[PDB]
Every structure is written in structure tokens, then in C-alpha cells.
């Protein structure tokens, strides 16, 4: 939020603040594989709250590229992402929720064991979804099924504990 905006204007923001006429790709000043994800990834997740142009564009594109190319750099940082995820979701803004759920789907397929590691944090991040359970209702179901799919044997029941109405036939 304010944290991300400060980040955005600093020389150490790793993305070049420029637009190419060819398309909407972001240009990295610094190679992604060279970033300490312990520092940078939570800063980008702070941007989930962002709804203002151009902050939200760089937050979203940045998260996406770092998740896509993070490899084994992502899982070690998972605990640091939970509070920014929770904070975004608990705003109870549908647009922010829809971006955050798509991000979460990317997160749990981004690397091995990440879906499994998310399970102990279900109770921190799922509760607001009950308000918007059934468009956002379908996105929620879809997201919960991703969590189950890549979350190991203990995933269904922990989803169900937090989201009592959850059902699934994978």
C-alpha cells in the first residue's frame, strides 16, 4: 500500500518505469534470479492492496513475473507473504479479492511443496471468502479447488474447517 508506493519510487525498485509501444510487458532493471526474494517478494505482495494506476499494474505484473520465474526461491519466503495476503483480502474489496485469488492460484502452482505449505495458514487467509462465497463466487470455488489440488492429503479438511460450505469433486 503506502509501503508499496514508497518501494515503487526508490532506485531499488527492480522494474524499469517505462512503457514500450510494442506491448504491455514490464522491463526488469535487475535480473529476477538475482533478487533476494526474502526482501523483494513480500514488497510486491504489499501491492495487492493497490488499485491505483500505475502502481497496481507494476505490482501485479511484478508478482506474476517473480512467481513465474522464482523456482525454489519462493517456498522459503512463504511465511512472509501471509500477512500481506490476509491484509489485502480483509479489505473486503471485490476487485482486490479477485486479483488476490488469481495470484494465490499462481502461488500454489509456482513451485513444488508450496501448496502443501499453505495449508497451516488457511485459517488466516480463507475466512473473508465466506462472505463472498456463491464472478467472484466462481473464482472462490476455483481457487479453493486449486488449493486442494496442490495441497496434499490434509488440504480438504482444513479448507472445510474454515469454509464450512466447501465441497469438491476433483
Amino acid at each position: 500500500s503506502t509501503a508499496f508506493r514508497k518501494f515503487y519510487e526508490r532506485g531499488d525498485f527492480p522494474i524499469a518505469l517505462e512503457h514500450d509501444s510494442k506491448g504491455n510487458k514490464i522491463a526488469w532493471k535487475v535480473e529476477i534470479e538475482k533478487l533476494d526474494y526474502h526482501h523483494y517478494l513480500p514488497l510486491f505482495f504489499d501491492g495487492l492492496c493497490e488499485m491505483t494506476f500505475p502502481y497496481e499494474f507494476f505490482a501485479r505484473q511484478g508478482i506474476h513475473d517473480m512467481l513465474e520465474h522464482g523456482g525454489n526461491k519462493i517456498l522459503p519466503v512463504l511465511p512472509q507473504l501471509i500477512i500481506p495476503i490476509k491484509n489485502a483480502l480483509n479489505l473486503r474489496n471485490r476487485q482486490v479479492i479477485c486479483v488476490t485469488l488469481k495470484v494465490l492460484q499462481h502461488l500454489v502452482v509456482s513451485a513444488e511443496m508450496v501448496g502443501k505449505a499453505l495449508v497451516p495458514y488457511y485459517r488466516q487467509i480463507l475466512p473473508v471468502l465466506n462472505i463472498f462465497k456463491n464472478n467472484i463466487g466462481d473464482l472462490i470455488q476455483e481457487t479453493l479447488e486449486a488449493f486442494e489440488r496442490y495441497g496434499g492429503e490434509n488440504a480438504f479438511i482444513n479448507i472445510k474447517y474454515v469454509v464450512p460450505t466447501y465441497e469438491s469433486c476433483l
Binding site: 533476494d36 525454489n72 517456498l75 522459503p76 519466503v77 511465511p79 513444488e112 505449505a117
Partner: protein
Amino acid sequence: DVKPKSVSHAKKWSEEIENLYRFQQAGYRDETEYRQVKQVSMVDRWPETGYVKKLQRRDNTFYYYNKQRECDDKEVHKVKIYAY
């Protein structure tokens, strides 16, 4: 409950190795174990180099580290590199 699976020994000194050195001197595998054990906002680092500046140990004493490289080429081999 996030913990590495495989372990290798470092080959050539690098920035990454320097920092692993500093964590392990203080009794931590890496920044992930450090943040598990202690409640950490950010890690104190040297602005110019990004090197770890200070760490709190498990007995609550503190280790401080120099602005420039500390890992002697001799010591490089002893730095453990953890998997995931």
C-alpha cells in the same frame, strides 16, 4: 514448518556465499531459519553491499559483521548451501 531437504558445500565465493557465511556463523542455516527462530521485521544490512550487518543469536547475544567481505577463500568450502 518450512525446512530444506538437501545440503551441498559451496565452491566459489560469491555475494550469496558471503551472506550464508554470516548467517551460519551466528547459528542459522540461512535467512529462512533466522526468521523462523526470531521475530524479524527486516534484517540489518550494509547499504552499499547488501551484506548482513547484525544478527541476534539464539542465546540473545548479537553478532556484528564488517561492511566488506569476511569469508576468507579458505572458509568458502565450509559454507553449507541448502536445498529449497
